[PDB]
Design a protein around this nucleic acid. Sequence first.
RNA 1: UCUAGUCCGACUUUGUGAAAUGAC
Lengths: 203, 147, 100, 99
Amino acid sequence: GAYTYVSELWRKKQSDVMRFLQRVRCWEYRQLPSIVRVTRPTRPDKARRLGYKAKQGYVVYRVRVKRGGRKRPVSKGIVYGKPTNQGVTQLKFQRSKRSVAEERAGRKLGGLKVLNSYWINEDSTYKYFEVILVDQAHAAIRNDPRINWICNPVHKHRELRGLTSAGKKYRGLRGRGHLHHKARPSRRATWKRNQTLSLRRYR
Amino acid sequence: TTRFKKNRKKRGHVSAGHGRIGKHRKHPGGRGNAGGMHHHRILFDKYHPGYFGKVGMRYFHKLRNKFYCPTVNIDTLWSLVPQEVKDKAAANKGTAPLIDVTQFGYFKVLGKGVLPTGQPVVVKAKLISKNAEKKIKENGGAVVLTA
Amino acid sequence: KQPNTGISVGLNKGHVVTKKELAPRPSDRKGKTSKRIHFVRSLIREVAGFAPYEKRITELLKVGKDKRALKVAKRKLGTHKRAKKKREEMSSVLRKMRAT
Amino acid sequence: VNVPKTKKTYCKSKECKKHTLHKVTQYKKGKDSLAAQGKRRYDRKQSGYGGQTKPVFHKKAKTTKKIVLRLQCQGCKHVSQHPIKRCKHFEIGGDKKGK
RNA sequence: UCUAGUCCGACUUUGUGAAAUGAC
Ligand SMILES: [K+]
Ligand SMILES: [K+]
Ligand SMILES: [K+]
Ligand SMILES: [K+]
Ligand SMILES: [Mg+2]
Ligand SMILES: [Mg+2]
Ligand SMILES: [Mg+2]
Ligand SMILES: [Mg+2]
Ligand SMILES: [Mg+2]
Ligand SMILES: [Mg+2]
Ligand SMILES: [Mg+2]
Ligand SMILES: [Mg+2]
Ligand SMILES: [Zn+2]
């Protein structure tokens, strides 16, 4: 049982050992393109607890995403509207950087299914994630009862519908009760249900 | 019912009952509750005193079940007893019926009205007013508390 | 936590009922780990060391600035509950370090 | 307007409920707290974009204020407030006329 | 009443040393 040592070591990100390793890796990633296939996960312990298995069909990609907020993509920063909507900067994207990394890999790798992803490194300008993807057409995957659920058509482009682990977070589904109740079954479904004017036959 | 609508009686009368001078315009006084303080001020003050302003303490996430406390008066207590049990009450004065108001969806017993003459009753309730207890005792009864 | 008095008001109010202890559950030992996990975490602490802000906390505890050490911990960790737990951890590390 | 330093007036305290000696001082509005609910709501409303979200009075007309006398009872050490009419010049304990 | 841009400071990117001075 060696994974606990690795996992606990990765909890000490500000230690000298990790600061050195992360510093060297961060330089290496900057020199390579924004989406790159990696021969094996950089964090095998973290990968396997998110569903990764060391078998044919599982692939890992490193995705680089730029950091910061979302400047409103409007020409010259001009908004035609009331002052409440005139803001241009200090606006934040409703989805997270982790979600963006999954979407970037998912769109590019149209022949694969996105399973999950995890943080691996960051600098002031870029944030780095590893995305776990599955070749749903590979026989080893289709014959595996624990993962072959992802071969079904309902699981097409999970990342683009906010159905991954990162997707559930930014939709407000990580949690229930009085603090998260408006997020189920979906935020827009809740709105439509509450706005419905029910006109019964006998009223 | 369209045939009883008075607009039908006004067919051929030009203004449809809304006048030639004033006419029927879209919203000549604003929509809904507009101008409650400015040009509908008299209406609000005359018919809705207290409308504007704030009073009392807020109560975040107030659940009404905590405050549930249905009440029953003394004058209505006898009506809860079944008719067959009323005859037994008048047939033996040594014992008294036990009226458990909680079994009839009541928590507190208030003291409006009077009890039947010469009929002691043992009242079982969560809460009771002092007048209700006094009237029960002076009639020969007793009060038992429950929860 | 006495039995209910049977009255609707006052202390220990409520319907009279025979209370019993809840049956033991596996989740009762939540927050407790095996001996191996403690062994693993202890070893990794030796290999990894302490973070820069933890070093700052222990330096303040050496000069006896306990109050300032807690304020630094709360600013870093965020909550008073975690801050005072962190300060005690640094004190324990220092307490058995000066004794060696 | 000149007001005497001391004044013998009625005291509402249950201890006194009678006329007692009072010390006269001028009331001054205290500092606005940041924790007051009205301030907490205003700061929330003002945050982000939208600019000024509340009216800002500009058409000042009054040239005076209603000065309030703070009367502290010497028996019970309690305070009562007594407004006076508008005046431009006000003092407490000034030299009396003639003297 | 606001805003793109722009100027300015902090944190971040951000590591390795030395000296002077100062604080605890
Ligand atoms: K617009
Ligand atoms: K608006
Ligand atoms: K009419
Ligand atoms: K605003
Ligand atoms: Mg392979
Ligand atoms: Mg519901
Ligand atoms: Mg006519
Ligand atoms: Mg007309
Ligand atoms: Mg009209
Ligand atoms: Mg109309
Ligand atoms: Mg805010
Ligand atoms: Mg702002
Ligand atoms: Zn007094």
